[PDB]
């Protein structure tokens, strides 16, 4: 998914925020990892909403 901001860091089991609630959620086991990187100059879109 293309979620951005500090809500990427808030991605964790629990800790309900303002974006991570209705964007993506895992069961209360989280049997895996989560990869994220700063795509500043990669997906820079002005009107790509």
């Amino acid at each position: 998914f293309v979620i951005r901001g500090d809500e990427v860091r808030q991605i964790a089991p629990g800790q309900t925020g303002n974006i991570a609630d209705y964007n993506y959620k895992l069961p209360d086991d989280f049997t895996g990892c989560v990869i994220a990187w700063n795509s500043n100059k990669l997906d820079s879109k002005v009107s790509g909403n």
């Binding site: 500090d6 629990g14 800790q15 309900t16 925020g17």
Partner: protein, 50 residues
């Protein structure tokens, strides 16, 4: 830190899930309670600070 701002608030129905849209980098390190669980417990008195 020289002069604190301690406001012992009175009874209200303030929902603690309001500052979820605050400024970026809003850490919540609750050492004794749970952040998402602050919606059903009835606390006696809250002692805010600043």
């Amino acid at each position: 830190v020289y002069a604190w701002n301690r406001k012992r608030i009175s009874n209200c129905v303030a929902d603690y899930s309001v500052l979820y849209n605050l400024a970026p980098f809003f850490t919540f390190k609750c050492y004794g309670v749970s952040p998402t669980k602050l919606n059903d417990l009835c606390f006696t008195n809250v002692y805010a600070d600043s």
